[PDB]
Ligand SMILES: *[C@@H]1O[C@H](CO)[C@@H](O[C@@H]2O[C@H](CO)[C@@H](O[C@@H]3O[C@H](CO[C@H]4O[C@H](CO)[C@@H](O)[C@H](O)[C@@H]4O[C@H]4O[C@H](CO)[C@@H](O)[C@H](O)[C@@H]4O)[C@@H](O)[C@H](O[C@H]4O[C@H](CO)[C@@H](O)[C@H](O)[C@@H]4O)[C@@H]3O)[C@H](O)[C@H]2NC(C)=O)[C@H](O)[C@H]1NC(C)=O
Ligand SMILES: *[C@@H]1O[C@H](CO)[C@@H](O[C@@H]2O[C@H](CO)[C@@H](O)[C@H](O)[C@H]2NC(C)=O)[C@H](O)[C@H]1NC(C)=O
Ligand SMILES: OC[C@H]1O[C@@](CO)(O[C@H]2O[C@H](CO)[C@@H](O)[C@H](O)[C@H]2O)[C@@H](O)[C@@H]1O
Ligand SMILES: *[C@@H]1O[C@H](CO)[C@@H](O)[C@H](O)[C@H]1NC(C)=O
């Protein structure tokens with residue numbers, strides 16, 4: 351039996367999964383490739399497994415598309431991206447491991463451009479198109495994950511590749527006139543000292559005002575204003591960070607509008623190796639993200655699988671322009687049951703809980719609107735409290751604040767032996783203005799009776815005004831919780847493995863352990879139907 355397998359998240363029928371690869375749309379069909387281990391449930395024998403969808407929620411399997419077959423990828427087929435050439439033709443740039451264990455860059459073309467499921471791919475004999483050597487002096491063990499490519503004003507292709515010199519992470523830029531002969535730019539698009547290896551770089555334009563995505567190559571009209579995003583996966587910290595900034599076409603350099611570190615993450619919990627693509631069908635940019643297991647490696651081997659992708663999110667620039675907003679693709683809403691469980695104008699007094707009934711609690715979508723009564727009852731933040739994760743760590747739900755904790759017990763046992771808390775605290779900011787600080791925590795210290803699991807607590811700040819009602823959403827899916835505070839302004843994914851709170855035996859609460867009572871304006875819980883995934 352498989353109590354931890356998800357009913358509506360992407361995962362292979364079995365075995366190991368990590369980074370999402372080459373996502374794209376071709377002929378109105380969504381593709382996902384992914385790092386897969388056909389043999390075991392740990393990392394190894396890494397191939398590009400392949401699935402397709404018409405809605406990003408339901409996925410049909412297909413045989414691996416890119417696996418070791420030539421000198422340029424004999425030892426493995428690591429991450430990479432698909433670019434759509436201006437004639438509609440899709441191509442994949444990916445890292446291969448050559449016979450000398452060097453990380454080289456390889457191209458793949460589809461074999462039959464009339465196959466709408468793009469089943470089979472052909473690799474040029476001219477690969478590697480891009481390799482470390484003695485001239486360029488690139489570290490051969492640190493030259494991976496090409497991005498989607500963007501065509502410049504000079505009709506010349508750009509692509510970046512994640513790397514590092516010493517402790518210096520950088521994005522090595524390559525330019526091409528024809529997409530077959532790539533020459534290394536003398537200059538990195540960007541670099542940061544003391545960061546370490548830059549994995550899974552991503553680089554895409556985003557609109558200054560609007561929710562709609564931007565074609566990756568689009569130019570910044572004097573009448574339509576664009577900003578650029580650079581996303582990196584830091585091998586050392588194991589997190590994804592982005593920075594908003596201007597792309598100087600002349601220099602070919604990314605300049606983050608400081609400050610901009612102190613850098614934002616897409617997701618403040620378990621989330622890594624993320625990658626975007628342009629959904630040309632609906633003009634949105636979609637973000638894919640890998641959430642690995644928090645269980646022991648011992649358990650992965652026993653259950654026979656490891657790793658899932660989050661629900662893919664629509665991503666756009668917030669009005670302030672200081673951060674990105676994410677929100678689960680609207681298609682996942684189709685999985686909702688018809689009978690919505692609703693609760694209005696309820697009062698959660700100090701130390702109270704309110705069970706949501708009549709919803710499959712291990713497989714649900716839930717949205718709360720909290721409202722605080724009197725902001726002047728908020729504790730002033732301690733001057734030293736600047737790391738949101740450490741704040742949530744020290745003050746568990748048992749520690750009372752003026753305002754908070756209030757939020758949700760999810761994947762909870764009847765008598766709360768096991769529960770995962772996704773909650774808020776409100777503070778008054780340490781400055782002359784009447785600014786407030788909203789804290790969002792994902793607490794999984796008491797999420798499972800088995801101690802073996804990674805019970806690390808996650809935290810994020812939310813840029814919303816608590817004069818307004820506080821918004822919280824949670825997608826609950828057996829062993830994964832995806833929490834969104836402030837309508838997508840703060841995202842936290844976590845992985846919990848309850849011993850008691852399983853399937854029919856799991857419950858859903860809204861709670862409040864603050865000193866002050868808070869109002870639940872509105873709460874909606876939908877049971878979530880299963881998806882058709884390989
Ligand atoms: C794939 O999944 C892997 C497992 O899920 C994952 O690796 C795991 O990563 C997490 C972090 O995301 C590791 O977290 C554990 O947390 C403890 C340290 O926490 C301290 O700092 C935290 C903030 O970073 C706070 O939340 C805590 O309060 C705590 O704070 C104390 O210390 C700080 C600074 O030192 C100080 O400021 C405070 O005052 C506090 O005193 C540790 O206890 C854990 O150590 C454990 O793991 C190692 C394994 O090598 C072993 O020594 C033991 O098992 C030990 O229990 C740990 O750091 C977690 O450990 C990781 N697990 C493993 C097996 O590596 C991996 O990141 C995922 N991959 C991707 C790509 O997402
Ligand atoms: C090139 O990058 C590689 C990959 O990170 C470096 O190898 C690691 O760092 C040192 C080697 O001096 C060792 O402590 C580790 O064993 C290596 N990492 C692992 C576990 O694979 C290498 O140092 C870099 N080379 C140079 C000269 O920059
Ligand atoms: O599967 C390889 C693929 O994964 C990434 C990002 O998830 O790197 C992971 O795997 C590497 C190969 O062992 C590790 O060195 C690295 O620490 C880990 O994050 C990509 O960089 C790579 O293309
Ligand atoms: C590719 O095009 C279509 C795929 O649907 C198929 O009818 C045809 O046989 C394929 N072409 C060949 C010969 O590979």
Ligand SMILES: [Zn+2]
Nearest residue numbers: 403408409410
């Ligand atoms: Zn289908």
Ligand SMILES: [Zn+2]
Nearest residue numbers: 540541542606
């Ligand atoms: Zn920087």
Ligand SMILES: [Zn+2]
Nearest residue numbers: 587588589739
């Ligand atoms: Zn960390």
Ligand SMILES: [Zn+2]
Nearest residue numbers: 725726784817
């Ligand atoms: Zn006020």
